[PDB]
Amino acid sequence: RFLKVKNWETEVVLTDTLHLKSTLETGCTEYICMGSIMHPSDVATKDQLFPLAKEFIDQYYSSIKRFGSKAHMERLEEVNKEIDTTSTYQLKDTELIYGAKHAWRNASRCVGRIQWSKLQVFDARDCTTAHGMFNYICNHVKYATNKGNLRSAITIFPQRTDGKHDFRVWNSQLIRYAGYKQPDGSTLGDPANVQFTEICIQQGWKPPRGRFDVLPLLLQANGNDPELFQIPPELVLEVPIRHPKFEWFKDLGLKWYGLPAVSNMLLEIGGLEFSACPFSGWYMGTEIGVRDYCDNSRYNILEEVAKKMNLDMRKTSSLWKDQALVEINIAVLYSFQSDKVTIVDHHSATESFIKHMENEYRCRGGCPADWVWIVPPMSGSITPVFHQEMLNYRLTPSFEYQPDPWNTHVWKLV
Amino acid sequence: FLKVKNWETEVVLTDTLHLKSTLETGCTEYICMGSIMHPSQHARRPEDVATKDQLFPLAKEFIDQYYSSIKRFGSKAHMERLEEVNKEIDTTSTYQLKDTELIYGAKHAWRNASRCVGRIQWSKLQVFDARDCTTAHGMFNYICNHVKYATNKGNLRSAITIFPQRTDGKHDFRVWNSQLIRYAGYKQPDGSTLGDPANVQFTEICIQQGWKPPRGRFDVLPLLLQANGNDPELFQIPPELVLEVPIRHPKFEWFKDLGLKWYGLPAVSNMLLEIGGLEFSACPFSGWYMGTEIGVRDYCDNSRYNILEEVAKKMNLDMRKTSSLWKDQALVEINIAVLYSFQSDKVTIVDHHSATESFIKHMENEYRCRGGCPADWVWIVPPMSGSITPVFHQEMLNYRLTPSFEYQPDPWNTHVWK
Ligand code: HEM
Ligand code: HEM
Ligand SMILES: Cc1cc(N)nc2cc(-c3ccc(CCN)cc3O)c(F)cc12
Ligand SMILES: Cc1cc(N)nc2cc(-c3ccc(CCN)cc3O)c(F)cc12
Ligand SMILES: C[C@H](O)[C@H](O)[C@H]1CNc2nc(N)[nH]c(=O)c2N1
Ligand SMILES: C[C@H](O)[C@H](O)[C@H]1CNc2nc(N)[nH]c(=O)c2N1
Ligand SMILES: [Zn+2]
């Protein structure tokens, strides 16, 4: 059995055999499609962990062309002894590196996957305390930032055990600006992060109450209450946002951090759950420039840019919003390029993704892709992914959503 | 029950209408096909003239649904109608829709069209019955009157014209044109393309049929009409029925000097309308444009007009690398100009902000009174500036309800000539 996908711009047709190897649900049914549902739908027993581990070990030994070998059979037997005696098992380092990389390779929502095989993996499964987690994250940040020459990296903390002893980064990203609601309903800083900012303040953080406050890290080790730590400022690389033509643009006082570093997702390898696994790459311009200033729930310098462009903001059909949105994204890209901080534009990114998709179909038999997320948030139909049919399915290892840790944490102090 | 949520406003809607869905979407619990153009071939009936136990259960379902819609289920006229449909099938292997039934089903095929951001207008549809038509000449007369009515000197009105339903499959009525008004596309000797590059194949079929092409740049193609399965025939739409808007820009005086224009009336004519097992293979329908359809897809696809280049040139943009966003910037101006020209000439048009906001209101309406509204996020989100429109942050459920508009293969792949 085979499935085809067409590109209506180039007429190229690709044949997907890989979809046969997925066993995780997508959320759709035979009669309803849920492709635009954002999140669709305690810990693994012995009898559930055996076959999940078997599946992973099998695919790992297949990938290194050693399937059915004496080493393959010994590892399988060695894994079952652990599950049978301890109700869990420990990944080898080769297996951890392999699975982290393939979790990225399998991320159907990520346009950036042409880079998957160059992923620096930091094994932190020996960490025991939040001070330990802070050390590991600071080293991650320093390495990934590389003075502007950003490098992909993931840092993997101990796996879940019984669910009562989890490691979490409570931050959604390692570097984010605080947001403060004002008595008068206005907002200072980043409106996206208001909730987490209150959580920090309640935990004892002394907020500067400025426009671009780097939030503290809220780090949970082994199921204990989370603890606050200030990332050393000289580890946070930032780019002041200016425009190549509009000299007034710098006078908006804007800037953004250079390291996108997501920390709230859960890494699943062979049934093991790594509930704290911060990973980072580099930005596509529109994630700062379309959604991190111009979403209706964000900085809303859209109107200020349109005001400063003397645009007709009375009627929609003037397309001032569209027009000011373009200029902001031009400003973001020019800024990072000038300060030699790695960034990619949506055209260059989507073009690379198409090449990646083609290559993955050739050597792997398919490439799960989520069009709804792969298509950039602006200028969609003038980019080549727009006319590219795509198949979406869930392979493992994968990165999964998990609930916010304050919703489920049972506290310990006083 | 299934919930949809809008992440800007946190409005949550609860969907039970999907329980009435009949056809497969192509998706499974293990694979999603939502960006496949045609993911499923699940149809309600087989390839040609069905047997009784194939046609009648679909007719009963539709007749049932129509009489329920008017609070008359099990009434005298409903039981009579069922028997009448049974005897017609028993004696002709098909049946004929009453005019109320035809009007209901056309409007509900639009209401069910999950890809259409325009459906807040769905029940204001003018239905022209053309089921008495027997030749291409008659089809041409019906189509002209359709074009004149819908254009309405620029105050556009929605309309569909419905020709005789398919009978055995050999006597189909077809409009070979994909839309009623399209521009020719000429393949050039030096390899390039003049005109409009989607319609190249169709432009050649017209010339091959004897059409003498003026070989200009905005050459309204002729109509190519097939009646009762016969060879199709050429007709030239009278120009005074083809309203066109010259494109200028409110700010750039040099824009109009690109010598650019577009027609006011989008009229899709290659789709199939299906009601209670019946298939109307010729059912051209028209509304009015969202601005992006002209000026994002019909000027700025790579395999279409591709005159982003010239607009960027005259704007003196740096086209050396893509990080300058010269494509994005010229694409905006083109769309600013399209809206300006149409509004300046009092020809109906809707910008993508207004249309998406209308669609969000329409979803709420539909969930309040109908228990749901099937929507294809991939097609509802406009092709530019998606995330600054309200539909971008709106979850959607896509399911297939009948009556519906369906795809059908281009008739030159299946037509045996004479
Ligand atoms: C190296 C440059 C990278 C680029 C340019 C990139 C780009 C993107 C973009 C634009 C998104 C959509 C986010 C949004 O629209 O809000 C995304 C999602 C995602 N990225 Fe990448 N990415 C990169 C590296 C990585 C790495 C290193 C990983 C992990 C090892 C990763 C894993 C993911 C995942 C799991 C998602 C989707 C999560 C979800 O929402 O379900 N990416 N990426
Ligand atoms: C009145 C103004 C209308 C507007 C602004 C509108 C808008 C749109 C747009 C923008 C699309 C996507 C087209 C594309 O980008 O390729 C679409 C699709 C569609 N429209 Fe509408 N529409 C309108 C009226 C109608 C009417 C009157 C009908 C039928 C009675 C209709 C039936 C459909 C169908 C069936 C599709 C999807 C066809 C497919 O599967 O490709 N629309 N509409
Ligand atoms: C590694 C990485 C790099 C990058 N350059 N960007 C990324 C964006 C997201 C991401 C952030 C937020 C949301 C939900 C809100 N839109 C979904 C995401 O995929 C992510 F996880 C990882 C990213
Ligand atoms: C009634 C109507 C009005 C309008 N203003 N626009 C419409 C666009 C399409 C349409 C056209 C082409 C394609 C494929 C290439 N994009 C899909 C469509 O849905 C359509 F059927 C009907 C439309
Ligand atoms: C509701 C909607 O599906 C949701 O907000 C998604 C849509 N697609 C997206 N696509 C990307 N790349 N990023 C996003 O945040 C979103 N948001
Ligand atoms: C392959 C891709 O899904 C396809 O070309 C679709 C995407 N979404 C679209 N959406 C609209 N409104 N119109 C289109 O032509 C398309 N094209
Ligand atoms: Zn689906």
CSV table of C-alpha atoms in Angstrom, one decimal, chain A residues 171-173 175-181 187-200 205 213 215 256-257 292 297-299:
chain,number,residue,atom,x,y,z
A,171,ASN,CA,9.2,28.3,31.6
A,172,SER,CA,7.7,27.8,28.2
A,173,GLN,CA,11.0,29.0,26.7
A,175,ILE,CA,14.5,33.2,27.4
A,176,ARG,CA,11.3,35.2,27.5
A,177,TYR,CA,10.3,38.8,28.4
A,178,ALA,CA,7.9,39.4,31.3
A,179,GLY,CA,4.5,40.9,31.0
A,180,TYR,CA,2.7,43.0,33.6
A,181,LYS,CA,-1.0,43.9,33.5
A,187,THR,CA,0.0,45.9,29.5
A,188,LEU,CA,3.8,46.4,30.0
A,189,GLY,CA,6.2,44.0,28.3
A,190,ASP,CA,5.0,40.9,26.5
A,191,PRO,CA,1.2,40.1,26.9
A,192,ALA,CA,1.9,36.5,26.0
A,193,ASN,CA,3.7,35.9,29.3
A,194,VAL,CA,1.5,37.7,31.8
A,195,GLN,CA,0.4,34.4,33.6
A,196,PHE,CA,3.9,33.0,34.0
A,197,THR,CA,5.1,36.4,35.1
A,198,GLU,CA,2.5,36.4,38.0
A,199,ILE,CA,3.7,32.9,39.0
A,200,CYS,CA,7.3,34.1,39.2
A,205,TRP,CA,10.9,37.2,42.0
A,213,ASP,CA,12.7,42.0,31.5
A,215,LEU,CA,12.1,36.2,33.1
A,256,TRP,CA,14.3,40.7,20.9
A,257,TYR,CA,16.4,37.8,22.2
A,292,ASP,CA,5.8,38.4,18.6
A,297,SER,CA,-2.6,39.3,22.0
A,298,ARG,CA,1.0,40.7,21.7
A,299,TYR,CA,3.0,43.9,21.6
